[model samples]
Target: MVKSFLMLGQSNMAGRGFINEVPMIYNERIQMLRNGRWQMMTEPINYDRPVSGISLAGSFADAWSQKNQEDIIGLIPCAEGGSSIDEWALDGVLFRHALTEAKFAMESSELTGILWHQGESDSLNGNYKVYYKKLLLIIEALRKELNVPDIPIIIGGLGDFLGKERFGKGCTEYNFINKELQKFAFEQDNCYFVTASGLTCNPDGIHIDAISQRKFGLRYFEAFFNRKHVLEPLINENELLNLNYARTHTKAEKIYIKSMDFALGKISYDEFTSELMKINNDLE
Candidate 1:
């Protein structure tokens, strides 16, 4: 059977990458379903023209094509740029719009999973925490609405460069929320977090370059497959041994891993780099 995915969320999810236009490849699999009408795009349709975030549909299609060479993958692009998490609530305007579009798409095709990349707009709203709670509620609603609770969800973290200075405090809060969400994914069996750290964005600091967007897609693939492919190794042999030893020796060490899992967004750049160095050292 052919598998289909839904790409939902704010501007970033809509794709504000360096490319000015949606690539031609995505037209093959992307269709808009609305009001019981299925409008297929033989060519790229500009839902929100002039937006700059990397298109999730384009990225997902590219990755899925590479991975499942023999299978036909379809993506329903239901994302609206510049929407907030709070706006994703069931009764909210953005949610209603997105749901209408998404439901139409689902009615038209068999959806396999959801690709979610939101939270930046929430950072600027000063309601990042509230948005986080609303995001969970939205997820719950989506499961019920789609009639598939266990459906895989691939969620991307908000890049640090986006609105970092303008909404510095809110940005920090949202990042913390993302860390918690990542932990939630670990606890939940079907959710995955696609880390966006180190993914280079464009000059505006709000969106990523095309290459970075493609890299982000690869990370999503790794998470979806439950494989470790992009992690950097630590530099020190002693630390490396300690990490391995801990995994085998004590419960505390296992807990340390869990802590690291929850601390993705909270760790300082220097600290994260150091951790990666340790992993790299071990790999060598």
Candidate 2:
């Protein structure tokens, strides 16, 4: 079967990893939606507009192919740069358009998951108070419409755009939205949050660099393959933590940190897998 994923979101998801700078992967098994039809996959997957470049979807499909040794990984790209979340509302044009594109891709492939990276534009000035609920509604609708209720959905949190040398004027709002996204993934079934706290971006500081995009895609895969339910909830970035929260907190932090270490070769791949599985033992 052709393993497929629906890739939808803003520019970051559209990908700013400059095409001229990033490396490329070659595989006949990888395919992407282009001109309303399936074509051999290539960089700048989101070709809906004139702007395009390297993106995580390439690496995402590559990794999935390598893992399953499958010949085909279909990716449906429908992201528009500078888009706001409200524009992606369940009943909105972009949302419906994405569904249409995804359905087209589904004609010859099995949709295994969804990859979403948005909210940067909305976080610029919009209030995030009801964003979580709205997001939930969209997710619910997508699953229902696609008839894939249990399919895993991976959401990437917004990177800090105003912190340090960054330049977003709406850092506070953006961070708040990120928290809501994190909390949602923590509580929701078959949903995962891929954090961007320490990720590097280009000089624009609004988009993740190529290296980070590749790494980010792998993180999405890890979470998709191994999201487990614990008796306790997630410990977010700004949450006040004491030793009382140690058991849960430590496990969560190490999961990301050790995963990072594994990616960076500080630990063997087997050790990384073994350590992550150990989290179940610490579950309350």
Candidate 3:
């Protein structure tokens, strides 16, 4: 059977980073299935691109080749940049379109999993948490609709740029919401959270750099393979101790806690810290 994966989510996943001069090579076992029909704009290739996640698709193919010693057969890139989790839900515009497109692809290919990268837009709208629930609903609906109950869904968290104050207070809220999402992923069996806490975002302080994108892909690959043992521990004992201290410490200390949680893979740091900052500000 051909191994396949689905790439889904927002601009970050769509890959807005600099496309390297050297094109990434795919393994012989993997075939990339293009579903680039859902363009954000009317143009053939919108140069005003939000961040395309295509780098991860290329990275996934590379990682699989390294690990399995065989090329992955197919990867379907069905993600659209600038989409929120709500937009990827069952009733959402992108979701409706994705379903139809995914269905057509599935008929001809074997799908193994889904790579989900989203939430930044939701954070901007202050609806990350609400939309997160909708994301879960979308996953459930996808499973039922596609008849692929056991398919693994790997969700990447928001990156660290939002954790910094330079991007304005809105990112702080987004960081916290993404953290909650990380916790939710831990509790769910079929769902796994891919960390982007310590990653460096581009100059814009929002999208991740290409190196970070590659790392993100590798992290997702490790999770997908259930090779946590092979993967480095996300947090060290000292970090964990600091996280505990921040939890009960001063208000600033609590912010530190959120940051630590995000760093240690305890939560989606960017979203978690962003949210905590908002609540802290309102209370003060």
Candidate 4:
């Protein structure tokens, strides 16, 4: 059986990963929707732009292929850089194009999921405020149009960096938008959010760089695989006990552990670190 993931989003999903840093190859196990056909997968998977270089999808497919040995993986790259959420609305050109391409891909294989990463553009100028409703509509549209109501839709949070967005200052809207995404995944059925908080972007400090893109893909893979690997299924007593023993010199750290449990889940990564820092600082 063939498993497929539709790669759609802005530049990050479109990928600005440095090609020189990646292994671009034609592997039979991994295929892509290229020129309206499933061809051996390679770099610049998203042809929607002239600047498609490296992407998280290639590594995502590779990891997926390795995990599901018997199944071939197909990637449908429909990302267009610098796109806003409204432009990805159901009636929007990008959405229609993705729908058409998805239908075309469905002719040969089955869709397993959707991999999405955008919101950088929306993070500017309070666009993040209304993005919640816009995003939910987009997801609903994809499922309705594809006729798969429960198909998994995995999305990545905006890159967590300072001074990377349009203004010379940091993109302040990142936290708000990411929280909304987390809330969406938490509230929706068959939806998951992959964290991009610590990922390294290109030299430009916006799009994910090659190494981190590979890492990001694996995180996407985890989120798509039934949420079992997203985080520990249950925190064992040993795990909790070990947290108390983690080479802590001064700051009492049990709060950090509880914070860890939620950060990866939201309620884990950056938010957790910040909470941990606050707890650590208050003690000092």
Per-model CA lDDT versus the true structure: 0.59, 0.74, 0.62, 0.75
Residues 58-133 of candidate 1 have per-residue lDDT tens digits of: 5455556556656556556667766666657788876666666666666656777888887766664456546546
Per-residue alpha-carbon lDDT of model 3 for 1-284, expressed as tens digits?
Answer: 55667778876776666656223432334455545322111111112254342355555555565566543446666677666665676778777776776776677767778878877777765675576567668888888887889888888877767746554235667676667667667776588877775666767777777666656666777677783321232444234323322432346544554665687788775689676977588654
* Candidate 2 segments exceeding 4 Å error: 163-167, 228-284
Decreasing lDDT order of the candidates: 4, 2, 3, 1
Tens digits of per-residue lDDT for model 2 on 1-284? 87778988888898888776655655456788886777777677887667677787876776676667645788898888877778888889989998998888788788899998888766745668778887889898999999999999999877765444455554557788888888888888898888775667888767788766766666676667676322222243112111112323335445766666798899999998898888857655
Q: What TM-scores do the predictions have?
A: 0.67, 0.76, 0.69, 0.77
Candidate 1 TM-score versus the reference: 0.67
Candidate 4 per-residue lDDT, tens place, 1-284, comes to 76778988988898888888865534467888886779767678886677778887876776676567688898998898888888898989989999999999988899989988888777768877798899989998889999889888888887777345443135567778888888888898888888775677765666778767766777777688756224222223234223322423334334634444685585636667777778767744
- Runs with alpha carbons beyond 4 Å of true place in candidate 3: 21-23, 35-54, 163-169, 227-284
What does each candidate score in C-alpha RMSD?
A: 16.6, 13.1, 18.4, 16.4
Task: Write down the worst ten-residue block by lDDT for model 3.
Answer: 37-46
User: Which is the leading candidate under TM-score?
Assistant: 4
Which 10 successive residues of model 4 have the least lDDT summed?
A: 232-241
